[PDB]
Amino acid sequence: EFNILLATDSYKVTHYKQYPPNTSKVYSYFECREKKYEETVFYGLQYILNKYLKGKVVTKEKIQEAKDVYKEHFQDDVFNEKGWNYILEKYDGHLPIEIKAVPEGFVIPRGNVLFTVENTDPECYWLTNWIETILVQSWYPITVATNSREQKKILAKYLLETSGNLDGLEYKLHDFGYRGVSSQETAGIGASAHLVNFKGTDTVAGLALIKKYYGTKDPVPGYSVPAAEHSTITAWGKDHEKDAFEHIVTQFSSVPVSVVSDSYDIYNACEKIWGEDLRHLIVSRSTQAPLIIRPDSGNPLDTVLKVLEILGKKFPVTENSKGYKLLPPYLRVIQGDGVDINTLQEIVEGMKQKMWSIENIAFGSGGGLLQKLTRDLLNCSFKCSYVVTNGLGINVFKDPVADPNKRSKKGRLSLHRTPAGNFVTLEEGKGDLEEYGQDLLHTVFKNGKVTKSYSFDEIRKNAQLNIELE
Amino acid sequence: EFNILLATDSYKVTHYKQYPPNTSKVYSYFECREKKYEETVFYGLQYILNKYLKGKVVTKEKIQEAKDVYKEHFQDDVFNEKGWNYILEKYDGHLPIEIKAVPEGFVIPRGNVLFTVENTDPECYWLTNWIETILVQSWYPITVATNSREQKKILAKYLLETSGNLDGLEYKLHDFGYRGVSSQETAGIGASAHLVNFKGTDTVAGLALIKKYYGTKDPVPGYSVPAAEHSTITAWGKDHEKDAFEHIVTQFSSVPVSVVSDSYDIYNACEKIWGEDLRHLIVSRSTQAPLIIRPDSGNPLDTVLKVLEILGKKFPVTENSKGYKLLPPYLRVIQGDGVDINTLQEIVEGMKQKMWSIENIAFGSGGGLLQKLTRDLLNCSFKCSYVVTNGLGINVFKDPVADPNKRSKKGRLSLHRTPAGNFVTLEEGKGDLEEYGQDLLHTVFKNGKVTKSYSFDEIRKNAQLNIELEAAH
């Protein structure tokens, strides 16, 4: 059983002794600080609220377990058994905390309050920052959802330019990161952040997370097709690559099938095996069930172009109305090696320069999609902005002389839409002046209860691109 | 509850239909492929074996649940319901798999077999690579332990040069990455991996993982001390930073305390608050309870040097037997901002050039220690190298023309010690010739049971640096 008393940074165990005496309120906020990634997708807090923060999270056993761990860990008795016992006895172990948050899926410029945390009982002034470590873990779904959405923007731009529409956009970046992330839990969280923007995933774990914590009208959030790996090709032996290819497309004659082709020689495989020996099993394929050739090695841009040139010479190519080349509908390419947001852009630009439509290709990304991201990327931070001490509110902030950017916001905060349709975060309680319309932060958690939830379908709508909107 | 059927990459669901007919054995191995990280700590498999792979992992309802997900996920029926049913019925839901592995904590050069996986029932030829995805996640504890150990090597060399010894080394890189990792589960795994090399962590979840999955003679594998954060200083208001400092040091007068001092002006706080207004509360402190000053901003090297120059002018500095400057025993510094393996090296080097012992300093690291790592850094990779079909064994490998680095090993493999004491992985069954002694892999898993295991104390001994061994000897 997860114990919330053991789910914080160790040193926070000692902070109840460090706040100013006679402090009744500690109020903190989360932003993606300003310093590329101009706007961020707010996603993932609802998972954390439901899995770890709601309901009876304190028991007498958990207090005792925590007290024993801490005594050994610090080699001293510093744990606040009294404050935690108070939460148990007065609230049946429910956290006296109020959290307000922008709705999930909202796309917010950098440097704006995204959510705020405060204690609702003066005895629990120390609790606000106790849960900061858990609350701060929302950067991974925010950063995955944002980085994924930025790649969709690149794909959208180039698909529109080379085909005149956005058909198939949501299947152009497939999540293959299950094995490349650091844990089973990360895999489910990360895959669900990607599906805010796309429909294709092989990280099954993300499907259950969405069903359990968000929900969708459709049976499942993400979809997949049969595909080969090097073990299912190479197990036939080096001389029988062709037998493996033929066996696989015949087993999956009625659905799309992706077949890794670079086990020994990707160029030989496209020109001689797919393009001559097995060509007859490809041209006969249905439009709904194309062969997806997959190259897994070499320079990503160079390999994709040479594969397309090979296939254009063995299969009938047409020219679409924007004047770009298009493979027959039974044949596509997927590039799943070395793809991150930087190389994705180099590739589609490379394709366009060579007059190949982005219709012809999809991308797989694993580590690039889910593991190669850090809290530094959007400068996700949680800081205290307001305290009440001896009954007086004071505005609280950090302003390091060495770095201008690390400066934090002051006082009570609110998020508002400007007259021109942009966003603004009001400091120092100035949102109460009501010069800026309604605060977009809503109470999503109060005193152990989740008070407002969003479905995965609304989140997807909130996160849409303008290009899709237009 | 966790379901093994739903714990693989989607396309692996369809692979039982892609192997050559009449395949009875699939055999696969894991390596950190060759391509600054010459050797890797093998750490982490025992967690996965116990948490996810052992015991009764298949049920009637887990099969049903999986059948229903995959029908909607693929919009077709491709799930191998009868294969999974066979494991349920014949083995009471235990995996007919054998896994052999190098002992945990072993420090192994790149390009060597670290573990192998094969099915022990011909009917379950498809099972070996079904569990590839779960087993490949061992890259992460391996990579954390390896990268953590490479920073220890830097700290050890500099500390030894500066002080003539390694006293305190295991507290010099402290884990602060709980909030900076992608999840609660990652936090515990990565912090346990760091604790293979050091004693200091603030990510409590690492302690319970070690105790449950590995075990230690001691009550806990990791330790911590009281420390302030920006919220506990700034909450007093800007004009009262001195009151905050005095309250915190007084509250933890008899134990070591870390106090972040850059809320407003690191240099003013060291020189005028610590160095003057509150100096009397610092120089009275016990050797066992020093004040640790923590700067959290600006250039990491420049800030540490100027902080130290300031403290050397307000406090009595000594010179140690190697000629390096040493703060009084009640005063230390910790640098927790911008520390990764690259900047860690620039700091101790710049300290050494300015004649400051590494005794004076420790480092904290968070995202740098536990989040900024990928499977690409050590090329951790799982591949089939041997199959049997129609009773004939076959050596299998992948050899992409474009990339020589992606070439994989062939046939049955074994790990051996060379005549010079080095490691070599023998291919194509050649270990069976017995020209290199016995295979160093052990069966750690077979048919649903964990068959060999290591305590965290054994793993720590295996992962020691050469310099530490030399010091002991």
Ligand SMILES: C[C@@H]1O[C@@H](Oc2c(-c3ccc(O)c(O)c3)oc3cc(O)cc(O)c3c2=O)[C@H](O)[C@H](O)[C@H]1O
């Ligand atoms: C076969 C394609 O399937 C769907 O998208 C997928 C693609 C894809 C491939 C190449 C293209 O040029 C492209 O436009 C899309 O690739 C996948 C690969 C997988 O391993 C799993 C998948 O679900 C898809 C996946 O869902 C889309 O319906 C697409 O319109 C159709 O061409």
Ligand SMILES: C[C@@H]1O[C@@H](Oc2c(-c3ccc(O)c(O)c3)oc3cc(O)cc(O)c3c2=O)[C@H](O)[C@H](O)[C@H]1O
């Ligand atoms: C007060 C120090 O505690 C221990 O090391 C730690 C240090 C440290 C600091 C400065 C130095 O120059 C140094 O050599 C070490 O810092 C910590 C900071 C934390 O937030 C938590 C900790 O557990 C330590 C932590 O455990 C060691 O036992 C060291 O001997 C002692 O000086």
Ligand SMILES: Nc1ncnc2c1ncn2[C@@H]1O[C@H](COP(=O)(O)CP(=O)(O)O)[C@@H](O)[C@H]1O
């Ligand atoms: N069926 C598939 N379709 C597209 N890309 C795939 C794929 N399977 C794997 N990949 C890409 O390759 C990565 C997995 O790497 P592998 O373990 O297959 C190759 P290696 O690094 O071990 O030599 C994934 O993150 C994904 O980007």
Ligand SMILES: Nc1ncnc2c1ncn2[C@@H]1O[C@H](COP(=O)(O)CP(=O)(O)O)[C@@H](O)[C@H]1O
């Ligand atoms: N008590 C402490 N001692 C040393 N370093 C610490 C520390 N607390 C935090 N850090 C460093 O600062 C990182 C966390 O930064 P914070 O979240 O406190 C400020 P910011 O990330 O919003 O700019 C940790 O990964 C760690 O490297």
